[PDB]
Amino acid sequence: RVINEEYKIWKKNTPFLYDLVMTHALEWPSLTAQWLPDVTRPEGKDFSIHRLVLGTHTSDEQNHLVIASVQLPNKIEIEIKINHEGEVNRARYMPQNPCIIATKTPSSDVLVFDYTKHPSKPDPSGECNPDLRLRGHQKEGYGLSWNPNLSGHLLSASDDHTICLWDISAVPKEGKVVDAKTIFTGHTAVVEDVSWHLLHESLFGSVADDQKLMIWDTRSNNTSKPSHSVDAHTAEVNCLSFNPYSEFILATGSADKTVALWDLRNLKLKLHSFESHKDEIFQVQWSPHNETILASSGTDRRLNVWDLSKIGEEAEDGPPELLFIHGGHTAKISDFSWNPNEPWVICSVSEDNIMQVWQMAENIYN
């Protein structure tokens, strides 16, 4: 309706809005997307090869954890599919060994796969044979975060109102199950997301349907009370992201249709509220290359890119800090990931099976 018209305007202006737009329909939709950190740049080719961690979300068919390759200028193909029990709610690679991938399932167990220990072609028997099953939750969830300073320390958020932490660094070779090291119980509702700080090995944040942002210190013996509890939004908080250049700064996204900006030195007062989304926000992620650049996505089928440096600048298109609106998707966006090796390239995935790899025009970000 308005979707068809707004899509027509988008199509029309696409040649001026983008330096790259690649569109691919996956067999089944992916709920998750994350660029792997590796890139190969062949000497006798005009492209480089990047890889993505994806998943399936099926009805009445075998699900898989997926690694796909993407050719980017200086084609998209499925390289690996691993049998997965149920849809992949979220999949994230371990920074210290990106062959290790944790997944969230529609049941309580959190799974870990080392993809070098599985065939690239899945057995049609469909057995899910994860390297580890991580126990501690009672329900499925979404939030998942590996500690970049403590190898094998993984956080998980669950619809059971808890956050679990595992340390998988010293599991016996033939051990296949790991019990949670610590369970954090501060939230009073579904915990939607969790994320470690980039620098402080003991600091992580969580957000929940209780409308709160909580900041946790793993060195504390009290796992029921966070270091800070913040009334962050006027509705469910679905996501958070720490700024990788500015150690005190983070962002949260919410069902209240806003992204909030926070300073860890004064959490009692929101620094800023980014307003433009027309429905619930499910993902927020800072740019890996640019300190003032943040993106957000959700149910309004839009991915907004925000530039903090334009806050308060001197109309009807949106606020000055709204840099770009990506309107390529015509269904709810499930996840997205900034490419870590190619500035301004994003992969976003929507519920209608579409994956887009795109890059706004150079003249837009200067």
């Binding site: 329909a25 089944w28 009805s59 849809e87």
Partner: peptide
Amino acid sequence: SRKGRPRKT
């Protein structure tokens, strides 16, 4: 809930 009903291409 959060997830929709998926369909194959």
